[PDB]
Design a binder for this molecule. Sequence first.
Ligand SMILES: [Zn+2]
Lengths: 39, 39
Amino acid sequence: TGRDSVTCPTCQGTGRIPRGQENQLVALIPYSDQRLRPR
Amino acid sequence: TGRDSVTCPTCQGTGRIPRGQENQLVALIPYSDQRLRPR
Ligand SMILES: [Zn+2]
């Protein structure tokens, strides 16, 4: 049992949404996830 | 590999959001999920 809540009516509680670059650009870049500190 | 997408910046891709009754009331009610047709 738990509090009352409904699944995301947008992402259907999946965990994936379209970036907002169109509205506001970004200032980041991709990289490689080395073994060191995987978490 | 897959298309580019970011996790829900609201539900953090968890799958739980506050209902919108405050904005718009509802006209539904709870019930029991009998064994017949579980899906
Ligand atoms: Zn979501």
